[PDB]
Amino acid sequence: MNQLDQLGTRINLICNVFDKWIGQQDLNYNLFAVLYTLATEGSRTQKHIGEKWSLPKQTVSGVCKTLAGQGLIEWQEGEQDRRKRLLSLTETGKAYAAPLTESAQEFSDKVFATFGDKRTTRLFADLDALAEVMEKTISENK
Amino acid sequence: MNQLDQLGTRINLICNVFDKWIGQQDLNYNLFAVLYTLATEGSRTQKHIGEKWSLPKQTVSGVCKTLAGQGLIEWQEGEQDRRKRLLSLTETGKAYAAPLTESAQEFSDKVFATFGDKRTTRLFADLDALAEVMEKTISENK
């Protein structure tokens, strides 16, 4: 079949597999996007989390409501609107995310065993290049 | 930073951008899955479509009900349920699907013209391998 078809089926398969691993961590993709980013990158904005994990603002806002009510995250104080202020894991959040970061590193190590870092850097640059072409072609059509 | 993090963000971006392109045809992933499979492969069961595009059976049946009600698709006749029966584009469905296959083929030629076919093979093989290891590791972790 067509290359686009070959790509589309593949990426959808692999995203589903990644979501399945997240499910094993007793989370969903949306919760993971917030929890994992803050655990690994430190303090980040809702905008950043949403752009990183390709989620709309409302998705991120929703998950942040729930996590903040569970006392797991907090927004840094400031004059800016809440949504623009830096989000951070609380102490309970850090404890809650510790297992997640560990099991992520574990899964990451098994998973990339056959790849070198040279190969993966290139694969990641390939995916980026792929995304760029696709976005640019889409922009043209708009 | 982390390999898994780098992979997860990038596959979800491609998946997103693919969905965005589909949306620019004024469709969605679920409809595309049925319409595009049928237009390019011919007759297929709901199961084949569901497996190819990584969609649950309920989702597929729902979309098929809508398209049949619009006279765009049809089940062949037989002494089994329609869900295990061959799905076909009607005449009105083929005219309906024509512009979609054309824009898909146009998108595919524009994207992969930049990406290159040896590099496309490399991306596919790497994604295949990653998906393989990930599935196997998740299976073990149960």
Numbering used by the authors:
A (entry chain B), B (entry chain A): 1 to 142
From the paper:
The proteins are homodimers comprising a largely helical dimerization domain linked to a DNA-binding domain that contains a winged helix–turn–helix motif. The repressor activity of MarR proteins is modulated by co-inducer binding, or in the case of OhrR oxidation of cysteines disrupting disulfide-bridge formation, both of which lead to a major rearrangement in the dimerization region such that the spacing of the DNA-binding domains is significantly altered, preventing DNA recognition.
The structure of NMB1585 was solved to a resolution of 2.1 Å by the multiple-wavelength anomalous dispersion method using seleno­methionine-substituted protein. Overall, the dimeric structure resembles those of other MarR proteins, with each subunit comprising a winged helix–turn–helix (wHtH) domain connected to an α-helical dimerization domain. The spacing of the recognition helices of the wHtH domain indicates that NMB1585 is pre-configured for DNA binding, with a putative inducer pocket that is largely occluded by the side chains of two aromatic residues (Tyr29 and Trp53). Thus, NMB1585 appears to be pre-configured for DNA binding, similar to the structures reported for the HucR regulator of D. radiodurans and a MarR-family protein from S. tokodaii. Overlaying of NMB1585 and MTH313 confirms the presence of a potential ligand-binding pocket in NMB1585 at a similar location to those in MTH313 and other MarR proteins. This may be explained by the occluded nature of the putative binding site observed in the crystal structure of NMB1585 and suggests that the protein may adopt this conformation in solution.
